[PDB]
Each structure stands twice: as C-alpha cells, then as structure tokens.
Amino acid sequence: AXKXX
Amino acid sequence: CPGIVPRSVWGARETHCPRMTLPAKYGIIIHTAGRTCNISDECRLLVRDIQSFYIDRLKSCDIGYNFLVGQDGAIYEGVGWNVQGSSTPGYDDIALGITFMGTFTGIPPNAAALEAAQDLIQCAMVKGYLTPNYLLVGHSDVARTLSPGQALYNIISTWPHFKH
Amino acid sequence: CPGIVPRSVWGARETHCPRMTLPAKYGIIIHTAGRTCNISDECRLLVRDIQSFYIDRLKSCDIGYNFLVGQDGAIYEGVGWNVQGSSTPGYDDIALGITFMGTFTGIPPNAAALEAAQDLIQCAMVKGYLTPNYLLVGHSDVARTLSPGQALYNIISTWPHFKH
Amino acid sequence: CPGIVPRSVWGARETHCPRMTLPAKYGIIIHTAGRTCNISDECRLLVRDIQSFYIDRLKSCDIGYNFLVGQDGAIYEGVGWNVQGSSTPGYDDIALGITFMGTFTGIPPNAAALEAAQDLIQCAMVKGYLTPNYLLVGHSDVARTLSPGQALYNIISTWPHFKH
C-alpha cells in the first residue's frame, strides 16, 4: 500500500 | 458482476468510508506480497486477515483494495465498486484496485485466477464502472513500490488498455 | 428421503472425492441445458451419460451435482448429501446443488418433477440437511451463467426462503 | 445509558434480526465460559470473535446476548436494547441478556466489571427498559445449562429483584 487523496 | 462472494459471506467488519464517484479512469493491478489460498473456506479467512491489518495496523478506514483474487478461481469483495481505496496517492479517488492474494515476483498466478481477474475487468467497463477509455497500469508505475511483482507485471503488460 | 433411486440402481462409476459438511447454508437450483427423460429406464441411462462427461471430459472428480430430477417423477442421486459438488466457485463447500435434467429457458418442468424437487428440499430442512434459515438461490445469482433458465428461475422465485 | 462502547467502535458485522418489545419483564446473567480480556483494544477483538461464532458455527441470526461485560471497566453492546437475543428458549422475547466475557465457575469478575453491570441494570428500569417490577434471574434457572457459573451465580443472588 501507499492514503492522501 | 457474477463470481463474487460478498462481504457478508466471508464476514467483513463494518465501516463507513468516503464513497467513490463512477466511472473510474484507472485500473491498477496489485499483489499482496504475502501468503496465498487454494480452497474456498481457506480464502474466506485470508480476506478477513487483510482487512484487519489495514484497519488496526495501518490506521486506514477500510481494506485499501476495491477487489481481491484467490487461486480457487473466485473473486472477493474488498471495499467494492462504490467506495474509494487507499493504495495510490493521487489516484485513489480516480481508480479501481484489483490485487492478487500472494507473492508473484518470480512465480505467476494459476489459470483459474488469471481468468477471473480479466472476467471482472471486462464486466466493469461493460457496465460503466470504468470509463470507455480507462487506462491499465501496474502499481509500480504510479507508486513507490515493486508491486505487483515482475512475473505478474510482465503478463499484464499485454492486456488491453495497458499504459505503456 | 423417500423417492430417490441410488447410484447402484442406475449403475454409477466408482470414485473417491472430497466430502461435504452438513448442514448447508445455500440451496442452488440448476439445469443441465441438455436433453430430458420421461421413462425410468431412459433416465437411468442419461444419468450415466452425465457422470462420464464430468469425469472424462471436464476432468472433474465426479458428477458436479448433489441430486438430479427426471420427468418420470423420480429423483436421482448424483454425488449425494455427503459429497461436495463442483458448479459454483466459492460456494461449493457450503451448498447443495439441485438440477433438473433438461433445458428450461422457455418451458418449465412438468408437475411431477417440480413436486419432487420441493418435497426433497422440505425433507432436507426437516432432517437438518439444510440450515433452518438456509437461502434459496438461482445459479445465475452466484455464478457466471444463465442457468437454470428464466422459466424455472421465475417459478422458484416464489418458493420459500428465496434470497431477493 | 453511559459507559457503553457501540457496535461501530469494535467493528461488528452487519445483521437484521427480530425486534424486542419493551419493557422486558426479565433480566438474565450469563457467562461465555471462554477466555477473558483486560485491555480495551484486546476486548474489542474478543467481542468480534464471539459474534462470528454465533453466526458461522451455531447458525444463529446474531450474537445471542443483549450486552456483554469486559474486565476492562467497560460495557460492550451485543444486539442492544431493541433486538431479541437467543440463549433461553421461551424467555427470549420477554428478557434482556447480560453476559460477562470469561469463565467464572471458580473465579468471579473484578470489581470494575460487577460495578459496570449493576449500573447498567439500574439505568434500564429508571428509563423504562425494564418493567417496574421485573425479575432478575440466573441463566441456570430457566435452561439446560450450568451457566453463568456457581461463583458469579452466588454474587447476583443478593442483587435487587432476584427470583428466589
């Protein structure tokens, strides 16, 4: 993963 | 779309996360880089473990993938068609994440599995879930990661709408 | 349950496949989309033809159905109550497949056959073979298929414990 | 009432079961007879495992308890005030089930837990959730069980409105 839009 | 066991069937935890606006423009293929499953009752359990890691360990609102794939030849619902995922910064609100349960860097997924993924994507655009000119991309193209594995990446590079 | 001709009577081939755990939460109505039968001696032969197709051609372990229905008013054992079938990826280890021998997309089965199917299901719940709150469903609801035909799908839609 | 962590904070699976008509004439103390929990993040997980046991193994509609008690001085919602439970055949539609998480046949709950329980019962009748002349009872008084254990059973025997 990778949150922030 | 058929061939999809719902959240209630594998026993998902309850959440209320930011919803997603359709249609989506991007389609991203991912691998979990972990263990896999071959028999039904066994896969239902692998999906429960992944959701819990995201909520409890990562502090995310819910499982960060829209859909998942087991090697038992069946598809499993993560957050779904109507909720945003959280794996690609700047693309989450405009994309649909489909990851395969397992580590496919050197070894790729079986036939049963690969067929289910393509069948799913095909059903998505046919129903407007994905823009008619959507773009297929590997996770490595838009994020700081090696996912979804070189072996899996090479195979999807020939698929339709891929970006490259 | 009464009204069932066993494997030895119609002359089934020997096999050794994975067992099923009772009760089963789902009940699946399916159809073969093939030819039908009206007289006993003819049905016994059609059943032999179906088993061999799953084994010799599809490379399956045995017939992929728990029970079958003929238009002679009788019920025929496929793999039985104690063995898993193979017709719905992801729901196999928790469901009982019931399929009518024939094609019913436009024309439904006679009264004799429909009565035997409902009697079987009722006998299934009463003996604990199916959870007291089981869910009735058509093959199309949980799979990539048009089975068991629109005609038959409409009739069973009024039947008890249906999901939808 | 105050001091209860709701189903959304501990991540309860979603269900839809028979409603309960208030006020309830009975109060029932029950114990799980399993493992216990002492810290918050740990109890929320324990409550998750129990509901899944009731749904997946016992084939019940939901967790069979109205409320549960953690050795952390907190109260956790099961099915709530407005839904019937399923632990006492014949008293379910006129009673409220309260069970402490753990095995208290030999050892009783800590001080913080017993306090949590009594405050809940008192808040119930003050708001009409429990008839003005309700009847508090032990699980063993109306069922084929040893629950909720001798140790905890003798404790509640002195509380207000007990029957005997």
Phi and psi (nearest 5°) for B113? -65, -55
Helix/strand/coil for D135: strand
The CA distance from D139 to D50, in Å, is: 18
Full residue range of the structural domain in which residue B1 is found? 1-164
Residue holding tokens 């009783």? Answer: D108
Residues of B with Cβ-Cβ distance to A3 under 8 angstroms: 60-61, 64, 86, 89, 92
Judge whether D75 and D7 are in contact, CB under 8 Å.
Answer: no
The CA distance from C102 to C37, in Å, is: 8
Show the 3-state SS of B86-135: CCCCCCHHHEEEEEECCCCCCCCCCHHHHHHHHHHHHHHHHCCCEEEEEE
Strand ranges of the sheet holding C95-100, from the earlier edge strand across to the other edge: C4-5, C75-77, C67-69, C95-100, C24-31, C130-138
The CA distance from C17 to C103, in Å, is: 28
Angle in degrees, CA D113, D116, D121, rounded to 5: 130
Residue holding tokens 């019937």? Answer: D84
Helix/strand/coil for D67: strand
Angle in degrees, CA B155, B161, B164, rounded to 5: 70
D132 by Cβ neighbours in 10 Å (0-12 / 13-18 / 19+) ranks as exposed
For B21, other C-beta atoms within 10 Å of its C-beta total: 9
For C159, other C-beta atoms within 10 Å of its C-beta total: 14
- Enumerate neighbours of B (3 or more CB pairs within 8 A): A, C, D
User: CB distance C90–B40 less than 8 Å?
Assistant: yes
The CA distance from C49 to C43, in Å, is: 10
Helix/strand/coil for C54: helix
Residues of C with Cβ-Cβ distance to B117 under 8 angstroms: none
Q: Which residue of A has its CA nearest to B99?
A: A1
Residues of C with Cβ-Cβ distance to B112 under 8 angstroms: 89
**Closest C-alpha to B1, from B111, B63, B75:** B75
User: CB distance B54–A5 less than 8 Å?
Assistant: no
CA distances from C38 to C71, C109, D9 (A): 5, 11, 59
Judge whether D31 and D103 are in contact, CB under 8 Å.
Answer: yes
**Closest C-alpha to C79, from C10, C15, C23:** C15
Contact A/D (≥3 CB pairs under 8 Å):
no
> In terms of DSSP bridges, do strands D75-77 and D67-69 run parallel, antiparallel, or are they unpaired?
antiparallel
Tokens of B130: 């994905």
Our measurement of the distance from residue D138's CA atom to the centroid of its chain's CA atoms, rounded to an integer in Å, reads 12
CA distances from C124 to B39, B45, B128 (A): 26, 28, 42
For C6, other C-beta atoms within 10 Å of its C-beta total: 10
**Closest C-alpha to B130, from B99, B86, B90, B161:** B161
Helix/strand/coil for B84: coil
Residue holding tokens 């159809």? Answer: C31
| H/E element, C115 | helix C111-126
Tokens of D53: 């046991």
**Closest C-alpha to D60, from D82, D78, D34:** D78
Our measurement of the distance from residue C161's CA atom to the centroid of its chain's CA atoms, rounded to an integer in Å, reads 17
Residues of B with Cβ-Cβ distance to D52 under 8 angstroms: 11
Nearest-neighbour CA in chain D from C136: distance (Å): 16
Tokens of B118: 């393509």
User: CB distance A2–B54 less than 8 Å?
Assistant: no
Query: What CATH number is attached to the domain comprising B10?
Result: 3.40.80.10
The reported resolution of this PDB entry, expressed in Å, is 2.1
What contacts C90, CB < 8 A, 6 or more positions away?
Answer: B3, B5, B40, B43, B72, B73, B74, C142
Cis peptide before D89 (omega within 30 of 0): no
The CA distance from B56 to D159, in Å, is: 39
User: CB distance C91–B41 less than 8 Å?
Assistant: no
Nearest-neighbour CA in chain A from B133: distance (Å): 22
Q: Which residue of A has its CA nearest to B94?
A: A5
User: CB distance C89–B119 less than 8 Å?
Assistant: no
Judge whether D60 and C133 are in contact, CB under 8 Å.
Answer: no
Judge whether B131 and B137 are in contact, CB under 8 Å.
Answer: no
Tokens of B78: 């993560």
Helix/strand/coil for B5: strand
% helix, strand, coil for chain C, step of 5: 30, 20, 50
| H/E element, B155 | helix B150-156
Residues of B with Cβ-Cβ distance to A4 under 8 angstroms: 89-90
Interface test with B, best of D13, D40, D53, D54 (most B CBs within 10 A): D13
Our measurement of the distance from residue C93's CA atom to the centroid of its chain's CA atoms, rounded to an integer in Å, reads 15
CA distances from B76 to B9, B98, B147, D36 (A): 10, 10, 20, 32
Tokens of D73: 């001085």
The CA distance from D66 to D79, in Å, is: 5
Q: CB-CB: which of C92, C94, C144 is closest to B3?
A: C144
Q: Beta-strand (E) ranges in C51-160?
A: 67-69, 75-77, 95-100, 130-138
CA distances from D109 to D70, D124, D134 (A): 9, 21, 24
> In terms of DSSP bridges, do strands B75-77 and D95-100 run parallel, antiparallel, or are they unpaired?
unpaired
Residue type, C157: S
Tokens of C68: 């079958």
Residues of D with Cβ-Cβ distance to B16 under 8 angstroms: 8
Residue holding tokens 């799913």? Answer: B120
Q: Domain tally for chain D?
A: 1
Residue type, B146: L
Q: What is the CA radius of gyration of chain C?
A: 14
Q: Is D91 annotated as a binding residue?
A: no
Question: For chain A, what's the residue count?
Answer: 5
Cis peptide before B148 (omega within 30 of 0): yes
The runs of H, that is alpha helices, within C36-110 are 40-52
**Closest C-alpha to B61, from A1, D80, D50, D45:** A1
Q: Which residue of D has its CA nearest to C130?
A: D59
Residue type, C100: F
Our measurement of the distance from residue D113's CA atom to the centroid of its chain's CA atoms, rounded to an integer in Å, reads 12
The CA distance from D101 to D150, in Å, is: 15
Contact C/A (≥3 CB pairs under 8 Å):
no
CA distances from C17 to C26, C84, D158 (A): 20, 8, 59
The CA distance from C139 to B142, in Å, is: 39
The CA distance from D153 to D104, in Å, is: 9
The CA distance from D104 to B106, in Å, is: 53
Angle in degrees, CA C110, C112, C117, rounded to 5: 100
Q: CB-CB: which of D11, D55, D56 is closest to B13?
A: D11
Angle in degrees, CA C69, C71, C74, rounded to 5: 55
Phi and psi (nearest 5°) for D4? -120, 125
Interface test with C, best of B40, B43, B114 (most C CBs within 10 A): B40
Judge whether D136 and D159 are in contact, CB under 8 Å.
Answer: yes
Residues of B with Cβ-Cβ distance to C94 under 8 angstroms: 40-41
Judge whether B20 and B78 are in contact, CB under 8 Å.
Answer: no
Q: Is D76 annotated as a binding residue?
A: no
